[PDB]
């Protein structure tokens, strides 16, 4: 597969455009992503929202203006010549006939496969308000791609000025197990096999583990060896304070 890296400036500007248009739940926002799709890792260096109109009760009602795309693309040529249209994003959790038919409309102005993005304006659950999705046919099949957040050197530093371990990983790991428990329940009521085929494949991945019991105690053996070094850390503080105590007793004498 491929990879997708989205800068935080793209997602920050995409959410405010939803507020600038005063779009309610009955409508969704659609926009275009710009970047370099030639490499294996798709990166979005620019984005802009489009005045997308849609009816929620009718999946056959959508409005997409292609005239603003041609003008905006010519205006970006005088800004950055390395920026081209790699695809288009959209808002809302649902994928309906409005978003599927417009996927081929942006394909005319996009050389490579347009990158599909579901943007969550309410930021509901976990992380990643926007997921990376690629369009492929065997019916439209949208496969998920790894979405990483990476910015430039001054971009990551500039955001830190705006905002200026063990238990953390455990609490985040337990939430993933709870999401899997509801994953098999919600899928079971939908059928009454493709996903279960991949699940049952990775489940199997003490006959051979009889010798694998010792490796647990081998790491615990080093922990006590580390605690021996960890104890030395405070053994010097045990010596360090007596370095003062000898000078402390020489104070009252001088007074």
């Amino acid at each position: 597969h491929e990879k997708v890296t989205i800068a935080p400036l793209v997602l920050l500007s995409a959410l405010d455009h939803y507020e600038r248009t005063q779009t309610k739940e009955n409508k969704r926002c659609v926009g275009v992503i710009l970047g370099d799709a030639n490499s294996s890792t798709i990166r979005v260096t620019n984005s802009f929202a489009l005045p997308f109109e849609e009816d929620e009760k009718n999946s056959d009602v959508w409005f997409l203006d292609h005239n603003y795309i041609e003008n905006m693309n010519e205006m970006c040529k005088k800004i950055n010549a390395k920026e081209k249209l790699i695809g288009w994003y959209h808002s809302g959790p649902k994928l309906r006939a409005s978003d599927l038919k417009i996927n081929e409309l942006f394909k005319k102005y996009t050389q490579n496969n347009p990158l599909l993005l579901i943007v969550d304006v309410k930021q509901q659950g976990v992380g990643l308000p926007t997921d990376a999705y690629v369009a492929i046919e065997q019916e439209k099949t949208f496969l998920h791609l790894p979405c990483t957040i990476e910015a430039e050197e001054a971009e990551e530093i500039g955001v830190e000025h705006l905002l200026r371990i063990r238990l953390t990983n455990q609490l985040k790991s337990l939430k993933g197990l709870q999401s899997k428990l509801k994953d098999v329940v919600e899928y079971l009521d939908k059928v009454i096999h493709t996903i279960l085929g991949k699940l049952q494949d990775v489940f199997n991945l003490n006959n051979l583990q009889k010798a694998l019991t010792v490796k647990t105690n081998d790491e615990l053996m080093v922990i006590y060896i580390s605690n021996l070094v960890r104890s030395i850390i405070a053994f010097d503080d045990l010596i360090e304070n007596k370095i003062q105590n000898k000078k402390i007793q020489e104070q009252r004498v001088k007074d």
């Binding site: 959410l15 248009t21 976990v126 957040i149 200026r164 063990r166 990983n169 370095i243």
Partner: protein, 284 residues
């Protein structure tokens, strides 16, 4: 009175990124927003401007390009009046813009609220994020509206103010630089979920699991040799002063290996206890 500029998280990152190409190269852009004088000032959205043969100048503003953008920026409702311009220059002690001098005088005639912003660092930011703006006072600061009633003004004490080359007059006519940043409700939750210190999320279950227990291929591998490293670090400095007096002329030598091997051991124990602590339920 003067104006206090309030750049949000959206405008600061966009105006900066446009001027991050090259140390010597200079670019320019346009700021838009809707506010009133008498303190308050906002910036909605910005976009870069094309560079002419003169680089950054007053003639570099294209009325044809600017008119086409305001029509394209109307679709999302971000189209507003022109609140000023922002430029890019390497920066100096005084007059950071090597070209623009009186160009603001032609800008003040079009809009009295227009300013000229110049980014000094150009990818030199150490985390301070210091940017410079400009406003033409012309004849003022004598028997008129009192600017320094707001924040951080009446500077110029001795020879040291800001960069310390400006002192009192700053760039021209004491424009009284005031800059502040703010974050809305949407900008607060978005940035903290994207970039706060370092973004490890989306791996959250494997965050410290994959970076450590699954990275054991070569990370801490040969912990018996890793413990040997802590031995040589301690034995080196502990050998210095065993008499608790002045011999090798040192002070923090016993504390040098103390803090270094403490964080390493703390990481060695947490990763090791969480190897079987994840409880993948292997059974048989």
């Amino acid at each position: 009175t003067k104006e206090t500029v309030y750049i949000s998280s959206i405008a600061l990152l966009k105006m900066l990124k446009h001027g991050r190409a090259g140390v010597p190269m200079e670019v320019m852009g346009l700021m838009l927003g809707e506010f009133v004088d008498d303190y308050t000032v906002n910036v909605v959205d910005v976009f870069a401007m094309p560079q002419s043969g003169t680089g950054v100048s007053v003639e570099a503003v294209d009325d044809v390009f600017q008119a086409k953008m305001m029509d394209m920026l109307k679709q999302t409702g971000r189209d507003q009046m022109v609140v000023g311009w922002y430029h890019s220059h390497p920066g100096f002690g005084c007059w950071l813009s090597s070209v623009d001098v009186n160009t603001q005088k032609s800008f003040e005639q079009l809009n009295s609220r227009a300013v000229a912003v110049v980014v000094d660092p150009i990818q030199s930011v150490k985390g301070k994020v210091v940017i410079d703006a400009f406003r033409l006072i012309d004849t003022g600061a004598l028997i008129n509206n009192l600017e320094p009633r707001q924040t951080t003004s009446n500077t110029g004490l001795l020879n040291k103010a800001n960069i310390q080359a400006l002192i009192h007059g700053l760039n021209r006519h004491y424009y009284s630089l005031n800059i502040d940043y703010h974050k809305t409700a949407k900008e607060t939750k978005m940035l903290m979920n994207l970039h706060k210190e370092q973004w490890q999320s989306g791996l959250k279950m494997y965050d410290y699991e994959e970076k450590e227990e699954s990275n054991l291929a070569a990370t801490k591998s040969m912990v018996k040799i890793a413990e040997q490293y802590s031995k040589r670090i301690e034995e080196e400095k502990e050998l210095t002063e065993e008499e608790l007096k002045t011999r090798y002329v040192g002070r923090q030598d016993p504390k040098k290996h103390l803090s270094e091997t403490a964080d390493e051991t703390l990481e060695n124990n947490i990763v090791s206890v969480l190897t079987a602590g994840v409880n993948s339920v292997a059974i048989k």
